[PDB]
Write a structure and sequence with these properties.
Protein name (chain B): Spike protein S2
Keywords: viral protein, human antibody, VIRAL PROTEIN-IMMUNE SYSTEM complex
Chains A, B: Spike glycoprotein
PDB class: viral protein/immune system
Oligomer: part of a larger assembly
Order of helices and strands of chain A: H
Entry title: Structure of SARS-CoV-2 Omicron BA.1.1.529 Spike trimer with two RBDs down in complex with the Fab fragment of human neutralizing antibody MB.02
Chain lengths: 49, 49
């Protein structure tokens, strides 16, 4: 593929790059259980002028 | 970045040019040492005395 030829002569050739694929994924987020009172802002009486 | 990896393929084969260019330099470095330090056919060892 790299040499663009079916026949390849003796030698050593750079071909591509290899890397370890990640096994899995980890997510670490802050652990605060309080629901954030967005609802209190929208659900209200007459808004500020 | 996987998305960036997708974008890189679009730009072209610029990497292959660099790999070819850098490889030629690397080969020449080994050749330079060969011409200077390898000019004797047989290794000579000094006499014990």
């Amino acid at each position: 593929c790299t040499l663009k030829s079916f026949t390849v002569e003796k030698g050593i050739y750079q071909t591509s790059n290899f890397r370890v694929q990640p096994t899995e994924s980890i997510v670490r987020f802050p652990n605060i259980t309080n629901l954030c009172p967005f609802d209190e802002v929208f659900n209200a009486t007459r808004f500020a002028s | 970045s996987t998305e960036c990896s997708n974008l890189l393929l679009q730009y072209g084969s610029f990497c292959t040019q660099l790999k070819r260019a850098l490889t030629g330099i690397a080969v020449e470095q080994d050749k330079n040492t060969q011409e200077v330090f390898a000019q004797v056919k047989q290794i000579y060892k000094t006499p014990p005395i």
